[PDB]
DNA sequence: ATTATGACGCT
DNA sequence: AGCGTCATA
């Protein structure tokens, strides 16, 4: 009872940027705005690979991963936008400098984990006990709260959908003690009140808008994120834990979508998260690992916690490329003209990322696939990143693979190159 | 013939 | 270290 942690210390925000790479594309392009659009690399194959739909776009039934030319076929008047193509590659560095910009402004609310080129943890702990000792203890207004949706309300004893989020609100607000600095409840509010400040900020300073989750820890926040997409933001309570997980899919929450998530659900024979509850943590550890079971045992009933990392700027800077099919390299002059134009497009960013940040990377990882390799990845060898020079990074990745050419004739390259990775990794201050 | 990334766990 | 898992546009 009284000794039962509840996992109610912190308040943690995830922040995702709706349809990112459309609306980056949008931005630019205002006839691409309030449009069912896509965002496609390369074009060749089968009008080239979607990697982002605007909401216009989905209502179509027009996926990620789906071909352009297969998505025309459900929307006929979809709009597509390219990702630029430089040294023979996709080169993703807009929406690399979109993220920076959000995050920047995220940046001047609280610490920040970057999660993705699209999204970010914020722990907003200290900021919601410094709004909380401003307010002076007087009640938080719906007016603060204009697009939050606190999940599991409206309940008990209006058929349109803001009619319902409003209701949601006031049942919410009308039961807060606003009267206790050390409410859980009341912390979220509080939470929460400051996301909207943060998406407002974002939009105004961007053009781009964002949805968000406010809960205790990071699973729910994103959780709670995906709840009601696009531009509004969820909380997610301690106390609506049972009731969310108690028909909630194993596999949606975050790590649990792969194998792990799968094993869970075979070995116990359940299927949603709520069904955990009924296991011991020794049970749970037994089947999935001392780590994992831990985590499974305390994150089935709300509980985690993973901190939100002070770390705002990516860890590692990777160039990779896929030859997939005929395009399959087979000569050494294929195999050399490709790492350097890797090792070119690296050199650019690094050396970006050297003056915006004061670091340097010190290590060089190279990494192939082979053709019939089901995995990703064949091969992966380090070396030593000591200049940023392409042509000696290319040169140095060459010398790392060169063994891996099976081939008797040193001028074709067998079995065929599907995949080369160049990352630059280990950073040091500078 | 989704592709281009990027973090973290295991041994 | 090299490999695998899981994740996101
Ligand atoms: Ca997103
Ligand atoms: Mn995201
Ligand atoms: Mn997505």
């Known amino acids: 009872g009284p000794h039962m942690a509840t996992g109610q210390?912190?308040?943690?925000?995830?922040?995702?940027?709706?349809?990112?790479?459309?609306?980056?594309?949008?931005?630019?392009?205002?006839?691409?705005?309030?449009?069912?659009?896509?965002?496609?690399?390369?074009?060749?194959?089968?009008?080239?690979?979607?990697?982002?739909?605007?909401?216009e776009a989905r209502a179509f039934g027009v996926t990620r991963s789906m071909w352009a030319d297969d998505a025309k076929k459900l929307c006929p008047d979809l709009l597509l936008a390219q990702v630029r193509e430089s040294r023979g590659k996709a080169n993703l560095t807009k929406y690399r400098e979109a993220s920076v910009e959000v995050m920047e402004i995220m940046s001047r609310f609280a610490v920040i984990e970057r999660a993705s080129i699209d999204e970010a943890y914020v722990d907003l702990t200290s900021?919601?006990?410094?709004?909380?000792?401003?307010?002076?203890?007087?009640?938080?207004?719906?007016?603060?709260?204009?697009?939050?949706?606190?999940?599991?309300?409206?309940?008990?004893?209006?058929v349109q959908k803001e009619g319902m989020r409003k209701q949601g609100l006031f049942q919410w607000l009308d039961s807060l003690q606003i009267d206790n600095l050390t409410s859980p409840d009341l912390q979220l509010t509080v939470g929460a009140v400051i996301v909207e400040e943060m998406r407002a900020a974002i939009e105004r300073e961007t053009g781009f808008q964002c949805s968000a989750?406010?809960?205790?820890?990071?699973?729910?926040?994103?959780?709670?994120?995906?709840?009601?997409?696009?531009?509004?933001?969820?909380?997610?309570?301690?106390?609506?834990?049972?009731?969310?997980?108690?028909?909630?899919?194993?596999?949606?929450?975050?790590?649990?979508?792969?194998?792990?998530?799968?094993?869970?659900?075979?070995i116990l024979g359940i299927e949603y998260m709520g069904e955990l509850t009924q296991f011991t943590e020794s049970q749970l550890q037994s089947h999935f690992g001392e780590k994992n079971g831990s985590w499974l045992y305390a994150m089935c009933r709300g509980i985690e916690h993973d901190p939100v990392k002070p770390r705002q700027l990516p860890k590692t800077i990777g160039c990779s490329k896929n030859f997939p099919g005929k395009t399959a390299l087979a000569t050494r002059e294929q195999v050399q003209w490709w790492l350097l134009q890797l090792a070119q497009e690296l050199e650019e960013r690094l050396t970006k990322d050297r003056?915006?940040?004061?670091?340097?990377?010190?290590?060089?990882?190279?990494?192939?696939?082979?053709?019939?390799?089901?995995?990703?990845?064949?091969?992966?060898?380090?070396?030593?990143?000591?200049?940023?020079?392409?042509?000696?990074?290319?040169?140095?990745?060459?010398?790392?693979?060169?063994?891996?050419?099976?081939?008797?004739?040193?001028t074709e390259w067998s079995p065929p190159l599907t995949m080369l990775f160049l990352c630059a990794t280990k950073f040091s201050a500078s």
């Not at 594309?25 to 605007?54: D, T």
């Not at 909380?235 to 790590?255: A, D, E, N, T, Y």
Request: glycine share 8%; charged share 20%; proline share 5%.
């Open 9 to 55: 210390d912190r308040v943690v925000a995830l922040v995702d940027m709706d349809c990112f790479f459309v609306q980056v594309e949008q931005r630019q392009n205002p006839h691409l705005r309030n449009k069912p659009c896509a965002v496609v690399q390369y074009k060749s194959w089968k009008g080239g690979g979607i990697i982002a739909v605007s909401y």
């Open 127 to 158: 900021a919601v006990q410094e709004r909380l000792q401003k307010l002076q203890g007087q009640p938080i207004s719906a007016d603060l709260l204009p697009s939050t949706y606190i999940e599991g309300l409206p309940q008990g004893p209006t």
């Open 213 to 266: 989750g406010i809960s205790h820890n990071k699973v729910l926040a994103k959780l709670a994120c995906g709840l009601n997409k696009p531009n509004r933001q969820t909380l997610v309570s301690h106390g609506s834990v049972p009731q969310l997980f108690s028909q909630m899919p194993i596999r949606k929450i975050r790590s649990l979508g792969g194998k792990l998530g799968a094993s869970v659900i075979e």
């Open 355 to 410: 003056n915006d940040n004061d670091r340097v990377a010190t290590q060089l990882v190279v990494s192939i696939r082979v053709q019939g390799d089901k995995r990703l990845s064949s091969l992966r060898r380090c070396c030593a990143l000591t200049r940023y020079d392409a042509h000696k990074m290319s040169h140095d990745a060459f010398t790392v693979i060169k063994n891996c050419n099976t081939s008797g004739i040193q």
